[PDB]
XYZ file of C-alpha atoms in Angstrom:
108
model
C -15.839 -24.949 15.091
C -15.392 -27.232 12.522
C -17.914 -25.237 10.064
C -17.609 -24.409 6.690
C -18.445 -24.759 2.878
C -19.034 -28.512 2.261
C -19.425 -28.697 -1.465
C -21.895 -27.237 -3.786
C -22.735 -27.522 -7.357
C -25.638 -25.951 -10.293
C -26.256 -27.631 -12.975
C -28.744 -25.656 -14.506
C -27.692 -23.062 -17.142
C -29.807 -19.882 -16.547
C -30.255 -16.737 -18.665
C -29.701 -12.697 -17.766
C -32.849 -10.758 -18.319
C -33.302 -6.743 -18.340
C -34.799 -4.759 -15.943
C -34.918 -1.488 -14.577
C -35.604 -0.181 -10.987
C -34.176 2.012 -8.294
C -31.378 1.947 -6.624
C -29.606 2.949 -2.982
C -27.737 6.510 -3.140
C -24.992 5.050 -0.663
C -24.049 1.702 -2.733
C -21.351 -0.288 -3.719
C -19.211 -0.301 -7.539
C -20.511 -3.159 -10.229
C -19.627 -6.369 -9.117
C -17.380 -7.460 -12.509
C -15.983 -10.737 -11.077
C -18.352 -12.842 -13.028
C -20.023 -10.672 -15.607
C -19.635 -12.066 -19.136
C -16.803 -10.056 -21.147
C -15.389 -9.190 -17.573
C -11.953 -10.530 -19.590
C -12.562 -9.170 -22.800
C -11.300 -5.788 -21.307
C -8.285 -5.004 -19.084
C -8.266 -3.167 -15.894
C -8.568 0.126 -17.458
C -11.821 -0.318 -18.839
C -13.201 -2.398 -16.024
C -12.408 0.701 -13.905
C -15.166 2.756 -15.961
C -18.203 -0.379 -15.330
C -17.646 -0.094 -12.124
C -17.685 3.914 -11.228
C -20.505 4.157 -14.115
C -21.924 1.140 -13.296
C -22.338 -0.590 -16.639
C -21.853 -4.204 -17.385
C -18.366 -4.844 -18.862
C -20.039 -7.589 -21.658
C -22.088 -4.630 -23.228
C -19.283 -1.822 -23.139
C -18.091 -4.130 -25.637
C -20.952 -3.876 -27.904
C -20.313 -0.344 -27.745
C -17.241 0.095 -28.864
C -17.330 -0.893 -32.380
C -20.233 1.198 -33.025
C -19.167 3.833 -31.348
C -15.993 3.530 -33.533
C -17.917 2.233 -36.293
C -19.519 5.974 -36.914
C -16.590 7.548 -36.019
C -14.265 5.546 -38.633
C -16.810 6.639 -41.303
C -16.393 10.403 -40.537
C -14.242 10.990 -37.852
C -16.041 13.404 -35.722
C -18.190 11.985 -33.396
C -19.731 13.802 -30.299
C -21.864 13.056 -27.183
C -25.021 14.230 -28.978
C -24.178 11.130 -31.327
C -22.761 8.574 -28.797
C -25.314 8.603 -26.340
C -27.530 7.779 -29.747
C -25.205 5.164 -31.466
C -25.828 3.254 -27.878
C -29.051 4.969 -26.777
C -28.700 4.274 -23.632
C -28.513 7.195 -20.859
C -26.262 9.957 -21.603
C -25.078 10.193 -18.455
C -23.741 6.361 -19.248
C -21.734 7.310 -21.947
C -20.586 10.231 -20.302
C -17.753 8.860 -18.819
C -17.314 6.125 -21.419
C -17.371 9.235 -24.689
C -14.708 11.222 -22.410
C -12.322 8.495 -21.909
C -12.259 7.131 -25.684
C -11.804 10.766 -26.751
C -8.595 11.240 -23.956
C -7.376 7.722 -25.123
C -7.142 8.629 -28.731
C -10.108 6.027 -29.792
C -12.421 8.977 -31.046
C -12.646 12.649 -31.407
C -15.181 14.883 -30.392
C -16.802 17.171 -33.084
């Protein structure tokens, strides 16, 4: 036996790039550990990256905004949401839904 990890170590500081492509029907949740922001948030929210598979550093960015609009008026809906983020509805779908049953938002 005797095997295992020896000692490793990067010194290079890489960058995160965006691209899009397909993916497996039959696949795994977002892998948080290790995503930037992955602390910003608390479990609740982390639950939502990883069912809806978005990155928990951006569903940061979208809060203010989202709220942002919202605190203006006060009546903010999907048709808007989706837009203030413009990303795929279907995204925000389950992001929208759970600000408006947390009391962040409310739908018009």
């Amino acid at each position: 036996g005797s095997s295992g990890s020896s000692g490793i170590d990067s010194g290079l500081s890489p960058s995160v790039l965006m691209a899009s492509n397909s993916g497996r029907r039959s696949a795994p949740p977002l892998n948080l550990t290790g995503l930037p922001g992955t602390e910003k948030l608390n479990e609740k929210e982390k639950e939502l990256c990883q069912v809806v598979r978005l990155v928990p550093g951006a569903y940061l960015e979208y809060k203010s905004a989202l709220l942002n609009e919202c605190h203006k008026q006060g009546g903010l809906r999907l048709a808007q949401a989706r837009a203030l983020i413009k990303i795929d509805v279907n995204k925000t779908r389950k992001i929208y839904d759970f600000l408006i049953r947390e009391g962040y938002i409310t739908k018009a």
